Amino acid sequence: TEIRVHQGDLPNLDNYRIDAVAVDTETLGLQPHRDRLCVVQLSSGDGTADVIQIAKGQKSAPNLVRLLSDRDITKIFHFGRFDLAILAHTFGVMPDVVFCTKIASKLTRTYTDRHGLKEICGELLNVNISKQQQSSDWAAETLSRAQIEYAASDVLYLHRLKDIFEERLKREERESVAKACFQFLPMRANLDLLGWSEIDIFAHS
Amino acid sequence: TEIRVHQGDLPNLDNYRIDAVAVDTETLGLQPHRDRLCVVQLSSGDGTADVIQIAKGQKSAPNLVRLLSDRDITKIFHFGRFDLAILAHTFGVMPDVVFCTKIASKLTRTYTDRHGLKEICGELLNVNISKQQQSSDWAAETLSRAQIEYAASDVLYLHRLKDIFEERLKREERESVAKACFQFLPMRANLDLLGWSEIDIFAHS
Amino acid sequence: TEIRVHQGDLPNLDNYRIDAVAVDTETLGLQPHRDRLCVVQLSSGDGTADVIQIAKGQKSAPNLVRLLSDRDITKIFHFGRFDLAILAHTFGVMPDVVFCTKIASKLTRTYTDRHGLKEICGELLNVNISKQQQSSDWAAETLSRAQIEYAASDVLYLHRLKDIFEERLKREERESVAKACFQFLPMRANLDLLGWSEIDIFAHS
Amino acid sequence: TEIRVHQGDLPNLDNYRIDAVAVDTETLGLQPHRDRLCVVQLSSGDGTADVIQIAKGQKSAPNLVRLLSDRDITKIFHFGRFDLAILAHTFGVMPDVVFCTKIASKLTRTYTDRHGLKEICGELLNVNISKQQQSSDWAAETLSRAQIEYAASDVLYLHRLKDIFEERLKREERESVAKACFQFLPMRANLDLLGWSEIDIFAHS
Amino acid sequence: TEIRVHQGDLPNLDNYRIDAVAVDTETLGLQPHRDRLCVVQLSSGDGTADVIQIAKGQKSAPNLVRLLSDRDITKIFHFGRFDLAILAHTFGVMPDVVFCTKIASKLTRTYTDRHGLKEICGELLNVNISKQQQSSDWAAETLSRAQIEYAASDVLYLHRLKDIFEERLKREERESVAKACFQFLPMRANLDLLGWSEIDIFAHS
Amino acid sequence: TEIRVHQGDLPNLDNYRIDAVAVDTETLGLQPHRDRLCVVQLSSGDGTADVIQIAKGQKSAPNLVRLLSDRDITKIFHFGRFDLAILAHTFGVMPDVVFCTKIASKLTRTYTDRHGLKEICGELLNVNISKQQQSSDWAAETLSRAQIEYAASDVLYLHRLKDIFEERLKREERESVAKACFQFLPMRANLDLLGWSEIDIFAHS
Amino acid sequence: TEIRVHQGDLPNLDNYRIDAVAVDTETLGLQPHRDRLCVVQLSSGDGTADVIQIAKGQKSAPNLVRLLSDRDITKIFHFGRFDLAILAHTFGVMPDVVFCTKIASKLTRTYTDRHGLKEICGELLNVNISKQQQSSDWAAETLSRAQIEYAASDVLYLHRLKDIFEERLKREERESVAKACFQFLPMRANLDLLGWSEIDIFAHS
Amino acid sequence: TEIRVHQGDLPNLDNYRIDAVAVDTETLGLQPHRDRLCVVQLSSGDGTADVIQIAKGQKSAPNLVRLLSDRDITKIFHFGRFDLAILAHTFGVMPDVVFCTKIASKLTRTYTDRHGLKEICGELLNVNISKQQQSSDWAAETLSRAQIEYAASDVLYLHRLKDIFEERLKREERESVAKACFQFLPMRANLDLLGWSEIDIFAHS
């Protein structure tokens, strides 16, 4: 696979005049206020991916942010609740046209309790994703080849998954449910940033 | 306290030419598929209430349902997640313009973990609500006077709470958060009806 | 109330030529293999009760056992799962025509999670049962008056409860469910005696 | 291994003029109100099995349903509590002559806590059951060969297990216990359909 | 009631020419290695008690310790597991003739799960023990009168309890079990001193 | 007591030329990043207290911060872990000469597990603190008299507690332990602000 | 591995004129009142073992019981708490001179939390025990060779373990602790038979 | 590798004229009051290590203790909380210049919750340490070759880890936090020795 590695931002949007872009992030941890965004991955759904290393203290990435803001382009995530939070905290823009394969999995793969990306890719595409056998310092000045391949591998399959999940949501007549969930997901992320990350706001207690 | 008790439906909406109506329900239990709707309470905020007994197997209540469907009238609930579910299950109409005092409490009364209606009314209005010392047969053919007064007490104060909560949401600058939560609440209730009542659809696990 | 106290057995069945008898027991504890039966209580529903003190090592109680065996008389219990076990373990006869107010409560009082006898009697009859504020031996040669009255209070109201629960079971269309539960209850007690007292035999795990 | 795959129903009952039939199901999940019946598997106890694909919204399967309601034919299940529930919900007929290998295991294999079908077949028959390599889409229009073979494997051994268990139920003198449990099992499944699926109806709490 | 308060040790054993003595202690906490012995209380079973203040770092109390080591005198404790440990840690002598009302309660009062001294005295002697409403500094140079009376109240009733528990142990044919438990109790206390305070040494895991 | 209420800051430090000042805060909740500081309370150890209401968005309080920064003045807190965190978050200055009555209680009152201020004041001083039991909105523009009295009550007694705790720490030879804990406490609060508030940094796991 | 299999009893005691015998049992489960004794294994400590099949309903085994009753012969068990209980329940004799390798392990192998026989034999002897990969029917008329060998492996190594544990107990000066524990172990087993199997009789709660 | 094994103490400090020494211990268990220190491992950070066997009852090791006391030499531990406790308990000297790789990991490796030495060495150095298959008797008079190699492997890499963690702490600007944690760590160990080993002294509860 071809993986293009960039510093700071995309050079241009020539490769992203499309209807949907797959998006993922890597960080130093699960807490956006402590653990900075380190790498952002994008894919057009073809056999290539873009991996953008983000510098410490970087507040802007103009081309990427133009992609994130374009209402005409659906951003595909796996568990977008986190990626939306860290992206909004880092660059100040919250995407509002999104698709999340984890919510879709919870709405369609009702015969299992395993909704991780590895299990989804294995079941839906017969593609074997190999997951890192160790964690690493994503803030390293120079990423290893294994890191680059793993980061690109996290976005290469989201288009095919979205297509399959759209077929399943149509078959079982749950399209409007998913649509409402996706509409609320950015605000769920905002609730996380504001301090309710450990609270199910809709629960009785 | 004037409490008007009706069988089946309101006679008309002459008392409900207003911008917001407080709504509550009573049932035989927490599971809409097993436990039928027994009582619906309404208040215009003028210190009076309407208590409508719903018959077993009743499928229609055109005047009440006309009120519930009117998008120009905000329906105020406390923990509307349940009431919306049972109302939609019973009458086939899902309200889509709502305000929930429990979500508002969780978004504003951040200094406590106790969000029940009795406590909210106590703190915000210095009004003492006396709650039943046991449960009762809400399906009884004739409700007792104590039952009627208890049922009306659940709607008499929701307008005043909504006014106060709106002041607090404005003060802490969380109005758009609450608006998005209320917009999603009917779909959360629908998700409950469809079989996800025990699942936080946005959680990682 | 007149409470007649007997040693070992009823003198005769002159007071029990009836269709239903209320039954309760008092033991040295919850484990029938260790904790012996001490008292058996009966009521015809006429507001009087018989309290039969059972001696240590007693193997027979012929008049009582004739009552327990008579298929034309329904035995009413509250949580008969236990009483059936201790009676069968002590006298060798398992009743097979029974009614249990706890199962009936779980099938009809779906609006609460409190199914104890005190709450049922309070909510269904407005009768205040006063429960012992301390424990007792019950193996005492001579029971106190307070002890005798506390024991009688457990059988004095079961007929009225059975009548009301039968009305509710008919109303909610659960008569055949209750009948099957009562038909299985003696075997559930037998399973307890055989060693499965801590196992839900129908659970997946 | 001959596996005949059908859509909707058996062509005839020529293969099922027998005293007992092994039955299993596959669904979209564990909740009958949400997750539809997708496959029914049958076996005569021979080296072949019948796999019947059930269409979405299908209300009738007359030849199969005649088999399910034939009181002269024992239906053998593993954990029939579920299969009975989904079958009764889908076709409106509750079988009432059943044998469950999981209840039998809990009554006889008291030296282990693993009562799943794989462990039982391994210990009792030295047969190696290979389980699904993923939780596939049982609602697929065309089942894969792996799916068909896995579905058949669930019924091929239930006759031999039923035979062995009935020797250890007579050896350990538990025949009447097992018979009563099997007689109650359809009502346990009905209770599941009515809304008590999470409730041990016989427990103290 | 007469309470004699002493510094360091009894002046003599003139009041303790008896076959059994009730013993209790007070400390700065539950961990003998950190929390020193502050008070020891004794009673002959009559209407008076002796309360002995132990100084910080005190290693010897010859008259009291003489009493503790006299094998012709049974030492009565409530939950002697603790008192034996702290006494041996402080004075270097482990009593080996003991009676514990907590073990006796667990072996006889099988109809309850509350085995504390207050509950025992109330049920077996209709005596109301009033327990201090706030812990206090038992190491204070001068004990208050209320403190002294509480400390004495903890030993005044143990003889009467021992007599009743012995009657019950004979009645229920558990004398040899209880005797063997009391014989083992000092070694359980030694195990506590050696570092096994959180381990049931007889448990499977 | 005389309680002087101020907006924003002390007028001067004329009342605080002292060696130790008692400090407490009130906020909108437990999470410093979400819940703003609303009230700061101070006491010289006399019979009066100062209550300074802090406005939304206030960044500066020069007289208060002079007191908080003065290394020659010990700041007495109860559970200073929180107050230090919120003070440093609000005004940008972390006090570094502190005494915490809760740590001292945990180091000296080893005979109890209840270390709250009400219980400590009750035991050590025989002073009854009455708690609001209401939990009001401390950000209100005008505080009620009850709010002012409750807020002052939290600082009026800390000097007397500090004196007693110092006596006990000397008696049990734990002075250097307390000194080390107090020296680390500001860094524990900083760790809370940085994102480790739910992590015991010294735990094995 | 000479293994002699017998029916009912040893033919004689010619192989057991020794000072310590390794003993183990197999049953149909963990509950002696429900699960009968099926096999008894004995070893003189040499390279051979005796495996005695016990018949259903068998009440006597005179030669075995002669061995179990002999006070001059130490019975070595691993987790003798169970074996003593089932032996006493089956044959009516409680051994009173015992050694348990699990208690010894808990008193000496303080550097691990795994006290099972496999771990002990592996660490202390470098002997690899391969345990049953599936439970089995120990009541089978004919045991398989693999089954018999598994049964023999449980007694073949206990003498060597006892020798090592006694040396280690001497090294850490815990001989009298172990002796007292072994003396109490038969009464712990009796307590299990009487109904306290789930209770640590020495715990505070 | 070169591993020098000594009895009692180092002969001299000729190999330890360095700024920092890696230190680890092995014991008979986790409780210093019960489980004696058995082995001490030292490294200069080069490819060799010293392994010192400590005798039972040994109170002094002058050269080792001289090293531990020298404030110009930083002692590197992994989870030094334990080693500091056991060293001070055994030799009476509490080191006060320390670096702990577990605290450093918890302050920098925020992207994982697994902070054990094996994981750290695997991630940071790509060195695979193979750990024993169980624990072992570290009190043996003669250690095995496998024991000696396993013990040396625990100190051989701490210098390289300290260098990497120090670079990361500078990078993420947490140097002063780490320094304060390390300054408090010896007092945390002292708190463990004094009896607060199970208590987070800074927690609210």
PDB file of N, CA and C in Angstrom, chain G residues 4 11 19 33 35 70 121 138 147 149 156 171 184:
ATOM      1  N   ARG G   4      -2.944 -51.159  41.500  1.00  0.00           N
ATOM      2  CA  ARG G   4      -3.833 -52.274  41.785  1.00  0.00           C
ATOM      3  C   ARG G   4      -5.240 -51.741  42.008  1.00  0.00           C
ATOM      4  N   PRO G  11      -7.828 -56.149  49.945  1.00  0.00           N
ATOM      5  CA  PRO G  11      -7.872 -57.553  50.367  1.00  0.00           C
ATOM      6  C   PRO G  11      -7.250 -57.764  51.732  1.00  0.00           C
ATOM      7  N   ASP G  19       4.129 -45.827  58.602  1.00  0.00           N
ATOM      8  CA  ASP G  19       3.846 -44.729  59.519  1.00  0.00           C
ATOM      9  C   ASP G  19       3.059 -43.586  58.895  1.00  0.00           C
ATOM     10  N   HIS G  33     -23.582 -34.526  50.926  1.00  0.00           N
ATOM     11  CA  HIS G  33     -24.927 -35.033  51.150  1.00  0.00           C
ATOM     12  C   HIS G  33     -25.607 -35.439  49.852  1.00  0.00           C
ATOM     13  N   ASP G  35     -23.539 -35.945  46.673  1.00  0.00           N
ATOM     14  CA  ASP G  35     -22.594 -36.513  45.714  1.00  0.00           C
ATOM     15  C   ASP G  35     -21.785 -37.634  46.358  1.00  0.00           C
ATOM     16  N   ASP G  70      -6.565 -45.911  62.524  1.00  0.00           N
ATOM     17  CA  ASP G  70      -5.367 -46.246  63.287  1.00  0.00           C
ATOM     18  C   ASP G  70      -4.631 -44.960  63.642  1.00  0.00           C
ATOM     19  N   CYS G 121       3.630 -29.564  43.076  1.00  0.00           N
ATOM     20  CA  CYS G 121       4.463 -30.652  42.578  1.00  0.00           C
ATOM     21  C   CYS G 121       5.467 -30.159  41.547  1.00  0.00           C
ATOM     22  N   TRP G 138     -17.018 -40.890  37.369  1.00  0.00           N
ATOM     23  CA  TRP G 138     -16.273 -41.728  38.297  1.00  0.00           C
ATOM     24  C   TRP G 138     -17.107 -42.888  38.817  1.00  0.00           C
ATOM     25  N   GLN G 147      -8.101 -42.898  33.145  1.00  0.00           N
ATOM     26  CA  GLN G 147      -8.793 -42.460  34.349  1.00  0.00           C
ATOM     27  C   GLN G 147      -8.091 -42.999  35.593  1.00  0.00           C
ATOM     28  N   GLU G 149      -5.003 -43.976  35.896  1.00  0.00           N
ATOM     29  CA  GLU G 149      -3.695 -43.344  36.032  1.00  0.00           C
ATOM     30  C   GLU G 149      -3.816 -41.933  36.592  1.00  0.00           C
ATOM     31  N   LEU G 156       0.664 -40.395  44.395  1.00  0.00           N
ATOM     32  CA  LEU G 156       2.023 -40.888  44.204  1.00  0.00           C
ATOM     33  C   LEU G 156       3.101 -39.985  44.795  1.00  0.00           C
ATOM     34  N   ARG G 171      12.323 -24.841  59.224  1.00  0.00           N
ATOM     35  CA  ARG G 171      13.192 -23.712  58.902  1.00  0.00           C
ATOM     36  C   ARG G 171      12.590 -22.377  59.331  1.00  0.00           C
ATOM     37  N   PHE G 184      -7.033 -29.210  64.350  1.00  0.00           N
ATOM     38  CA  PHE G 184      -8.389 -28.697  64.180  1.00  0.00           C
ATOM     39  C   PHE G 184      -9.049 -29.133  62.881  1.00  0.00           C
TER      40      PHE G 184
END
